[PDB]
Amino acid sequence: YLVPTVIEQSGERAFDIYSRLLKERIVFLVGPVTDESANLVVAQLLFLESENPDKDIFFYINSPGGSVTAGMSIYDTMNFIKPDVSTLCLGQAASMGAFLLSAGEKGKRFALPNSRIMIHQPLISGGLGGQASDIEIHARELLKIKEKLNRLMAKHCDRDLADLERDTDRDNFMSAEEAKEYGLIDQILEN
Amino acid sequence: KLPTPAEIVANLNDHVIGQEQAKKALAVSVYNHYKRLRHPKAGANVELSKSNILLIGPTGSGKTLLAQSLARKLDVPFVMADATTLTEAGYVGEDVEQIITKLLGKCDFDVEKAQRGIVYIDQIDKISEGVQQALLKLIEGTVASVPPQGEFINVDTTNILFICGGAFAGLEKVIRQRTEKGGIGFGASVHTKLFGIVEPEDLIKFGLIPELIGRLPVIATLEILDEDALINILTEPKNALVKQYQALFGMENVELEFEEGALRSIARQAMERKTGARGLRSIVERCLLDTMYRLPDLKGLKKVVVGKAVIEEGREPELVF
Amino acid sequence: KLPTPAEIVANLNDHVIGQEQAKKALAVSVYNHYKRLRHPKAGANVELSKSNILLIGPTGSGKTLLAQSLARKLDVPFVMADATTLTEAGYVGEDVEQIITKLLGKCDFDVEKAQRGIVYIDQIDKISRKTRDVSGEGVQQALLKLIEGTVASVPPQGGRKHPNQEFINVDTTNILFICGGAFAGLEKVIRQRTEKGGIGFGASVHSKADITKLFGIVEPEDLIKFGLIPELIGRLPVIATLEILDEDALINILTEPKNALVKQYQALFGMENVELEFEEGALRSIARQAMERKTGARGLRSIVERCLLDTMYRLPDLKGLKKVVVGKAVIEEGREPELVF
Amino acid sequence: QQALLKLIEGTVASVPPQGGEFINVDTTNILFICGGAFAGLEKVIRQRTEKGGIGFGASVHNADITKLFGIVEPEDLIKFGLIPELIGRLPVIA
Amino acid sequence: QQALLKLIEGTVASVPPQGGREFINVDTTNILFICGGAFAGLEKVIRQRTEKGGIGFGASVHSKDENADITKLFGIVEPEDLIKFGLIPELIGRLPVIA
Numbered sequence A: 001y002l003v004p005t006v007i008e009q010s011g012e013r014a015f016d017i018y019s020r021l022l023k024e025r026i027v028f029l030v031g032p033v034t035d036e037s038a039n040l041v042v043a044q045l046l047f048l049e050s051e052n053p054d055k056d057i058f059f060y061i062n063s064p065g066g067s068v069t070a071g072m073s074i075y076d077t078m079n080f081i082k083p084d085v086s087t088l089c090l091g092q093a094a095s096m097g098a099f100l101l102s103a104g105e106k107g108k109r110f111a112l113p114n115s116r117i118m119i120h121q122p123l124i125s126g127g128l129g130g131q132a133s134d135i136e137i138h139a140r141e142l143l144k145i146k147e148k149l150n151r152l153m154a155k156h157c158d159r160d161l162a163d164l165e166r167d168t169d170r171d172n173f174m175s176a177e178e179a180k181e182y183g184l185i186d187q188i189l190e191n
Numbered sequence B: 001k002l003p004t005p006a007e008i009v010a011n012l013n014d015h016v017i018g019q020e021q022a023k024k025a026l027a028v029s030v031y032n033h034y035k036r037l038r039h040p041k042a043g044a045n046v047e048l049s050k051s052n053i054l055l056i057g058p059t060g061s062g063k064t065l066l067a068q069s070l071a072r073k074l075d076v077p078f079v080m081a082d083a084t085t086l087t088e089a090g091y092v093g094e095d096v097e098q099i100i101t102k103l104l105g106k107c108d109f110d111v112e113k114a115q116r117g118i119v120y121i122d123q124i125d126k127i128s129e130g131v132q133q134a135l136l137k138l139i140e141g142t143v144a145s146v147p148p149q150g151e152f153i154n155v156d157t158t159n160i161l162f163i164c165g166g167a168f169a170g171l172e173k174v175i176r177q178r179t180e181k182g183g184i185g186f187g188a189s190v191h192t193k194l195f196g197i198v199e200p201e202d203l204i205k206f207g208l209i210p211e212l213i214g215r216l217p218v219i220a221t222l223e224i225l226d227e228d229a230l231i232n233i234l235t236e237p238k239n240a241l242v243k244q245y246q247a248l249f250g251m252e253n254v255e256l257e258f259e260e261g262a263l264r265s266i267a268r269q270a271m272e273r274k275t276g277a278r279g280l281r282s283i284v285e286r287c288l289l290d291t292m293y294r295l296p297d298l299k300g301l302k303k304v305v306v307g308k309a310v311i312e313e314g315r316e317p318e319l320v321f
Numbered sequence C: 001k002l003p004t005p006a007e008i009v010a011n012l013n014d015h016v017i018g019q020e021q022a023k024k025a026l027a028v029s030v031y032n033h034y035k036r037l038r039h040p041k042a043g044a045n046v047e048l049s050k051s052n053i054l055l056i057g058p059t060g061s062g063k064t065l066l067a068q069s070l071a072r073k074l075d076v077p078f079v080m081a082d083a084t085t086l087t088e089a090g091y092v093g094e095d096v097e098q099i100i101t102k103l104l105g106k107c108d109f110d111v112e113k114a115q116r117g118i119v120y121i122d123q124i125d126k127i128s129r130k131t132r133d134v135s136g137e138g139v140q141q142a143l144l145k146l147i148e149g150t151v152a153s154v155p156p157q158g159g160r161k162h163p164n165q166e167f168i169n170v171d172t173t174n175i176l177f178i179c180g181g182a183f184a185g186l187e188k189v190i191r192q193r194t195e196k197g198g199i200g201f202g203a204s205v206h207s208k209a210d211i212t213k214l215f216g217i218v219e220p221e222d223l224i225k226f227g228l229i230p231e232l233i234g235r236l237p238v239i240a241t242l243e244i245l246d247e248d249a250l251i252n253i254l255t256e257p258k259n260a261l262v263k264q265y266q267a268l269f270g271m272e273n274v275e276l277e278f279e280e281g282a283l284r285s286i287a288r289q290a291m292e293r294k295t296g297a298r299g300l301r302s303i304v305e306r307c308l309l310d311t312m313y314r315l316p317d318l319k320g321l322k323k324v325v326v327g328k329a330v331i332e333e334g335r336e337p338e339l340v341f
Numbered sequence D: 001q002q003a004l005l006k007l008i009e010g011t012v013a014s015v016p017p018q019g020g021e022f023i024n025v026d027t028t029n030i031l032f033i034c035g036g037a038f039a040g041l042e043k044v045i046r047q048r049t050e051k052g053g054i055g056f057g058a059s060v061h062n063a064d065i066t067k068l069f070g071i072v073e074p075e076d077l078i079k080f081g082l083i084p085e086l087i088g089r090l091p092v093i094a
Numbered sequence E: 001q002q003a004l005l006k007l008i009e010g011t012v013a014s015v016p017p018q019g020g021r022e023f024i025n026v027d028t029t030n031i032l033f034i035c036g037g038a039f040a041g042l043e044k045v046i047r048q049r050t051e052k053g054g055i056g057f058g059a060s061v062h063s064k065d066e067n068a069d070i071t072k073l074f075g076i077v078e079p080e081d082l083i084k085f086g087l088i089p090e091l092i093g094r095l096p097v098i099a
Ligand SMILES: Nc1ncnc2c1ncn2[C@@H]1O[C@H](COP(=O)(O)OP(=O)(O)OP(=O)(O)O)[C@@H](O)[C@H]1O
Pocket: B211, C015, C016, C017, C018, C019, C057, C058, C059, C060, C061, C062, C063, C064, C065, C066, C181, C182, C245, C253, C257, C297, C298
């Protein structure tokens, strides 16, 4: 895709439109969460804290999910850095995208009115081949990740761990209103 | 004697309407300036320095009128300069002290009066560097020489009060870049109060050299004239446009009158041009040209009533005989 | 007789806070200037020459103030020029002879007095070298002959430097020149030279001191890398450096100098017969606020004026107000001073 | 321009006598009518306006110096080279 | 440089009188002119001429000294270097002695 170039008045500085939005403390997570896309989010979160540790960071999420470890690098960076990270759901926040959406600062988690938010237990974090001893190890690690995700989700949503274990058993699709009632987001934006 | 900061605002309210914060700021700075000029300037006393003013406000807000009203009040000479009339290349020096020739000519070339005068510099923001450096060297104490009134004359500008002003258009966004959360975000501040909290880093980011900010310690802001103040301006001031044209009709036997809706509509038309009270004169003259040409021909006329339809539509003022 | 360098410094301390080494340099140079001027000029007497100064210091450190404070007790003509106003000879703008024109105007156009005067050239760093550079290297080249001994041809205070022009001959041999400027990118050059080091497994990595420390060890090599031509640095043998002002320097500037800002407003309040008092924390807060905004000693006046605005608006009417007190809250918070009757 | 401004505003001029004792003439009540073909004024105005636009829903567009001269502003004449204090003394623009 | 060609060479210059601005005619035919200057970037031109400084297998390489020897290079200066420096040949020919 051709990323448009915009001019900032200050003299003039030419930005691509995403660098221009980063200047306004807007970080985009678009598409699958990979090592490379997650590290760009981490790099932007670290950079924005240095620019101003007090001003809010706006984390715009339009993602179907992705790697758990990649999403956890974003998650720990969001919680570590001093400035509040507000999260906004555009289009969809599914799987780790919904996790990072609920991971925003409490009171500053938003969704657009027709966005779709989906929460579910993790799938394969990696293949389970080799010997039965190797498969047992990877199954145990996946169960630990499953419990860790449900526990952190329950903390984000102010719900019991038993509620998240029921609701993440299979793909749980929610409207913005249902996610607000659930505890994934705080407000729904209209205008 | 010398007018107190309260009496200055009292007399200055008759000519300017609104901008009370800038009015008191100018009054204090000017009173302190002309009290410093009364100090025992000799011996083991403290050498007193002046405090200049930076008037930030929209076009037509009354900055030049404020400076000229202060000058008329304090009997001092006054000349308005324009930073736009100073070129980057060339002898920026030779034409920056030509303003001194202008100020001297306004006071019979008596240096005793010009050295304690006032100078307003227009479009201080439109030079956002050689012009800035010359205005800085001149705002600070310097002895300049100009041709005679007909041998050269000397003028030391240390005791001259400088009131720079201009419509800093893009300054509010420079301020919002640090005062608000974000500009382009979904929920992030999408769009004179912020002019009131302006800090030196904003003016420097705007492109004003820091040494010029250092010699302009007083920053006063002027608010945009609303549709209400533009009506008072038409009626209340000592030199109101209604008063001028009523005198024009009054030297003859015809009494000019305006409808309140006419004043409100003509004030809204002036506000729609982004020029403030500057455009009021053109639209009033356009509206009254309907009769100023016919009135010579009309006989038996006693009064003319200017309705809102004359200002808004192609209507003629009602002629009652 | 002549004033010793100690006496010259004593009159620079009443106006400048800190910068002791540059005050030593200026005082010694002015003393040697006087001695050269009253040295016999014929016979077996050796011909003396001058040692010009390059006054380096950050923005708002006291260069222009050192020159103005020195000019009060010079007993010889003195001017303050700005190199940014200069240009090459054949291009629009001021020529280097206009400096001598100003120096000659300060002394009733007595050439014998201007030939023994002193000149301060400000913004000498803005004409750095980094086709025809009419505003930069060209000005440096035009200053080479003027700084050292030459016979300049100046206009009579009336016009430009034209061929169809009447002229006056002025010998700048004994005229002392004091160049000054805020070489911003000079600290980087000094750090590049003093911390070269190198890259690689087999290379020697050198250790890695702010503007003050680096300026204190400036050498001509750094000034050449900055943009000054060696022909100009050789004519400026003395290099005096200013230390950047800290918070304690700012509070001392507020209170210590003869015409200090606090004394300014105290005398201004003595007109209406009231006493103005600043708490120590108030001055410390004014210094912190001037430092945080990175203004320097420039912004102290704006802070004090914005804090005393509403009180000065009510001075000539509040009768019985024997004292005014400025506290730490008035500086840090949007408060009003204490008005004791 | 400056010597002309000093006359357009209220001043007193000294001029030779009626024969070969100078006469003092006060020009407070002398009306000045200045004129000229400002050849750069249409470009000055056309820079102030004539923004145009692009796209389907935008209006796109020899200089119509008639309507341009009909919308002259004092700042346009300042850009042409006239001193602002002279234009301020010329309020009527025909 | 162009204006000095006829001044260095023999001409008749018209200069103002002794006082204010009949002009005086002076013949510069027998007036000796001694030009002087610190040609800063001249040693680099002389080095580029005398020292090839090529690259490759078939090029003799020599940049083993960082600073140009100003004395040794100036001692072998020729009009070619002064022309590449910025002087015009008409002026160099009028300055036959290069010390
Ligand atoms: N050492 C000092 N002592 C007292 N006042 C100072 C000192 N340094 C700066 N100031 C204050 O700062 C103001 C201007 O400083 P000055 O012009 O001397 O700085 P500068 O070195 O010329 O800056 P620049 O290099 O940008 O020209 C003066 O009015 C003075 O009150």
